Design a protein around this ligand. Structure first.
Ligand SMILES: C[S@@+](CC[C@H](N)C(=O)[O-])C[C@H]1O[C@@H](n2cnc3c(N)ncnc32)[C@H](O)[C@@H]1O
Length: 259
């Protein structure tokens, strides 16, 4: 058993109020009041982020931890926060975005955020059975939370396998992907094998809630995986009991228009 496994057990033992206070304490949170109502009313001429994912990917890019360029694939795009972010980057030439949709899952939000015309959305697509194709940058933000850490480990393992399949097709592609449960043993093993062949490492974004252990793997960084994970587990465990709130920051606005 790992520190991350203990984190999960402590998290599941929180009351609803303890959980609400814990998940937000000390995290950066974009202010989505305006964005939420625009989307609800169906305004399509907006460049405000369609989801909380845009600022996470922007932080990775702005830190230099990811390289977004060329033909981009967004595997599991949901509302499209990463696809709209990528499409606004001048180095990006096109985005092919795929998501399953269906009951209980987010369909792409349709807006004129800068570069929207360079995105091809396909909803109703399962990426785990879809043949890879050529790409310069592969992105995947898949990983559904569950109270069962073993289920989260298996979901994470499937994402890493998908990445391996896209790297087999595109050995030179940049990769950035969510690792939902990085402390599980089959995840550590798969990440070690991925790093052995492709390089890369893990990083925690400051927008991730304390109620998720998610870390982002990118081929553009480095670092010992086990140490990266354990440092993060210890940080999450120490935050139980903290009552400070989140740090509110403005939401990203990419502007509107075609590229
Ligand atoms: C909520 S998103 C990540 C958020 C996104 N990066 C953003 O910025 O808006 C992950 C998405 O992957 C989708 N998904 C999960 N499994 C999938 C699969 N096997 N094939 C395609 N999409 C999947 C989920 O429905 C979910 O919408």
């Amino acid at each position: 058993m790992t520190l991350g496994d203990l984190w999960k057990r402590r998290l599941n033992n929180c009351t609803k109020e303890e959980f609400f206070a814990y998940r937000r304490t000390g995290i950066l949170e974009t202010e989505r009041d305006k964005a939420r109502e625009l989307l609800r009313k169906g305004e399509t001429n907006m460049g405000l982020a369609v989801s909380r994912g845009t600022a996470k990917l922007a932080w990775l890019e702005e830190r230099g931890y990811v390289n977004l360029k060329g033909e981009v694939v967004d595997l599991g795009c949901g509302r499209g926060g990463w696809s709209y972010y990528a499409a606004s980057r001048p180095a990006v030439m096109g985005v092919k975005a795929y998501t399953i949709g269906g009951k209980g899952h987010e369909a792409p939000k349709m807006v004129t955020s800068l570069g929207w015309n360079l995105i091809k959305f396909r909803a109703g697509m399962d990426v785990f059975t879809m043949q890879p194709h050529r790409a310069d940058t592969v992105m995947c933000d898949i990983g559904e939370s569950s109270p069962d850490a073993a289920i989260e480990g298996e979901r994470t393992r499937k994402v890493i396998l998908l990445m391996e399949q896209w790297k087999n097709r595109n050995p030179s592609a940049s990769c950035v992907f969510k690792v939902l449960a990085p402390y599980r043993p089959e995840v550590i093993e798969a990440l070690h094998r991925f790093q052995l062949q492709w390089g890369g490492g893990l990083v925690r974004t400051p927008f991730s809630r304390n109620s998720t252990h998610e870390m982002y793997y990118s081929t553009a960084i480095s670092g010992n995986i086990v140490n990266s994970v354990n440092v993060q587990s210890r940080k999450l465990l120490a935050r139980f009991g903290d009552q400070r709130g989140p740090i509110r920051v403005p939401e990203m606005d990419l502007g509107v228009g075609t590229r």
